[PDB]
Amino acid sequence: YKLICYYTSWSQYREGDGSCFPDAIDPFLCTHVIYSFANISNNEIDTWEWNDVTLYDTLNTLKNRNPKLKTLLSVGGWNFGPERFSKIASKTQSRRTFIKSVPPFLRTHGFDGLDLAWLYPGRRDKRHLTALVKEMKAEFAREAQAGTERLLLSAAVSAGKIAIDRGYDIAQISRHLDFISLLTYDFHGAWRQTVGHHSPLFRGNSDASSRFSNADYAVSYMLRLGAPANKLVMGIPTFGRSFTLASSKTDVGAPISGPGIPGRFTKEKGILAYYEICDFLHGATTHRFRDQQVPYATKGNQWVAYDDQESVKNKARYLKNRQLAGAMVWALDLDDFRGTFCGQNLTFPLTSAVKDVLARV
Ligand SMILES: CC(=O)N[C@@H]1[C@@H](O)[C@H](O[C@@H]2O[C@H](CO)[C@@H](O[C@H]3O[C@H](CO)[C@@H](O[C@@H]4O[C@H](CO)[C@@H](OC5O[C@H](CO)[C@@H](O[C@@H]6O[C@H](CO)[C@@H](O)[C@H](O)[C@H]6NC(C)=O)[C@H](O)[C@H]5NC(C)=O)[C@H](O)[C@H]4NC(C)=O)[C@H](O)[C@H]3NC(C)=O)[C@H](O)[C@H]2NC(C)=O)[C@@H](CO)O[C@H]1O
Ligand SMILES: *[C@@H]1O[C@H](CO)[C@@H](O[C@H]2O[C@H](CO)[C@@H](O[C@@H]3O[C@H](CO)[C@@H](O[C@H]4O[C@H](CO)[C@@H](O[C@@H]5O[C@H](CO)[C@@H](O)[C@H](O)[C@@H]5O)[C@H](O)[C@@H]4O)[C@H](O)[C@@H]3O)[C@H](O)[C@H]2NC(C)=O)[C@H](O)[C@H]1NC(C)=O
């Protein structure tokens, strides 16, 4: 089984214990570690943070301890505009320029592959996404002739049905990608005023609409569209999504006034790192959706939908039972990487719980 783990560039800037450097990563925890995110300047792959070359170097030294470890650099991300990806992929000339700049960059910094995070391709983009993937793969095969191990090519894909039908030719890109990470955790649309879980495993027998918004449907659908199970990787969040309640009602369908207040270290309305959630739990009321199989908590006017060791182990067993290629974790820096916030003196409790399940066959 594969254990794909993301590390974010900006996590280095968090205060105190929140600060996380590649250096804090257990070399034997994951099979693949993806650095997020690379940028695109003058139609060429480029660094993002001022100290990326230094951090790139720090992350890739981990392979001195675990020779089997594979690293990839991810391009795109949610802060990188989709229009930019769209513009580059639409013109064969700007697309070929981008493609050619990649292998040399990956080789200079010691990466074993490239991860595509175009979020997201629209109706007019579908055909070009396919061309981009296909041509990028062809360049990697051509570059391997130089005698060095062929670079890997992956992509992070939306788990929402409408998004899938709109911009992806799954059957086509599946044959060129080494693996596909399903983003099965942004299911509760940032649009409306209700409380809900962002990463439920199952539908939840007490609802009619949006049967599409849960990991199980997304996986089944991808398999139905043509994606082979041995190339599919299921995303498991290491963060939670918070809400500020508009009333004293704390259960399903309860009214929402907006995102939950920022975390002390994460400082971003709407989300909390798992290590922040562990602190938040003290004095909170914990509940669990039996049907969906995921937990949530409340304290004051704050409502949090998250994943714990149990929900995460549960998702890992599901993935195995369906014979998928493995799991993807977003993100190492949001897990209790120091092992000092969540009780158990265990480092990376969430990612470890997944690994343990994956290891038992
Ligand atoms: C919110 C929403 O609606 N979007 C949903 C998506 O999240 C989701 O996408 C997939 O799933 C995850 C999680 O859901 C996505 O989110 C992540 O990806 C985004 C990046 O593309 C993250 O955005 C960033 O936010 C951070 C924190 O606020 C940004 O902040 C900072 O970065 C700057 C610039 O680099 C730092 O600068 C430095 O500051 C120092 C002093 O201030 C200087 O000394 C230093 O020199 C200076 N700059 C230099 C030189 O570099 C700031 O310090 C730093 N911090 C602050 C002030 O807070 C970060 O830059 C943003 N990212 C980018 C690329 O711009 C987002 O936060 C993150 N979320 C989480 C929870 O981690 C992923 O994008 C995506 N996952 C994958 C696989 O790619 C989708 C569903 O998939 O749903 C969307 O609705
Ligand atoms: C990741 O990679 C991206 C892509 O390379 C990179 O982009 C930024 O790069 C440079 C460096 O910071 C920026 O430089 C500026 O680019 C803008 C182009 O958008 C230039 O003009 C802007 O400002 C004008 C007003 O000041 C605007 O108005 C114009 O006015 C003139 C007259 O003065 C008229 O003749 C025009 O018709 C027009 O009305 C104009 O619309 C424009 O917005 C500016 O001079 C300068 O060169 C870019 O801004 C960035 N590129 C973009 C955004 O397209 C990122 O830096 C990289 N990311 C990281 C974190 O590294």
Swiss-Prot record:
Similarity comment: Belongs to the glycosyl hydrolase 18 family.
| Chain's role | Carbohydrate-binding lectin with a preference for chitin. Has no chitinase activity. May play a role in tissue remodeling and in the capacity of cells to respond to and cope with changes in their environment. Plays a role in T-helper cell type 2 (Th2) inflammatory response and IL-13-induced inflammation, regulating allergen sensitization, inflammatory cell apoptosis, dendritic cell accumulation and M2 macrophage differentiation. Facilitates invasion of pathogenic enteric bacteria into colonic mucosa and lymphoid organs.
Query: Matching PANTHER family, A to Z?
Result: CHITINASE, CHITINASE-3-LIKE PROTEIN 1
Q: Which UniProt keywords apply?
A: Antimicrobial, Apoptosis, Cytoplasm, Disulfide bond, Endoplasmic reticulum, Glycoprotein, Inflammatory response, Lectin, Secreted, Signal
Q: Which Gene3D superfamilies match?
A: 3.10.50.10, Glycosidases (3.20.20.80)
SMART domains referenced in this protein's UniProt entry, alphabetically: Glyco_18
Q: Which GO terms describe its biological process?
A: activation of NF-kappaB-inducing kinase activity; apoptotic process; carbohydrate metabolic process; cellular response to tumor necrosis factor; chitin catabolic process; inflammatory response; lung development; positive regulation of angiogenesis
Q: Does Cytoplasm appear among the keywords?
A: yes
Provide the binding site for chitin. 49-50, 76-79, 120, 183-186, 241, 330
Q: Which residues are glycosylated?
A: 39, 345
Q: How does it assemble?
A: Monomer.
Q: Which organism is it from?
A: Capra hircus (Goat)
Annotated region Important for AKT1 activation and IL8 production: where? 302-316
Which GO molecular function entries does the Swiss-Prot or TrEMBL record give?
A: carbohydrate binding; chitin binding
The answer, when asked if Disulfide bond is one of the entry's keywords, is yes
Q: Which Pfam families match?
A: Glyco_hydro_18
Q: Which domain of life is it from?
A: Eukaryota
Q: Where in the cell is it found?
A: Secreted, Extracellular space; Cytoplasm; Cytoplasm, Perinuclear region; Endoplasmic reticulum
Write the protein's name.
Chitinase-3-like protein 1
> Which InterPro entries does the record associate with it?
Chitinase_II/V-like_cat (IPR011583), Chitinase_insertion_sf (IPR029070), Glyco_hydro18_cat (IPR001223), Glycoside_hydrolase_SF (IPR017853), Glycosyl_Hydrlase_18 (IPR050314)
Q: Using the record's annotation, list all stretches that form the GH18 domain.
A: 1-361
Q: GO CC terms on record? A: cytoplasm; endoplasmic reticulum; extracellular space; perinuclear region of cytoplasm
Cysteines engaged in disulfide bonds, as pairs: 5-30, 278-342
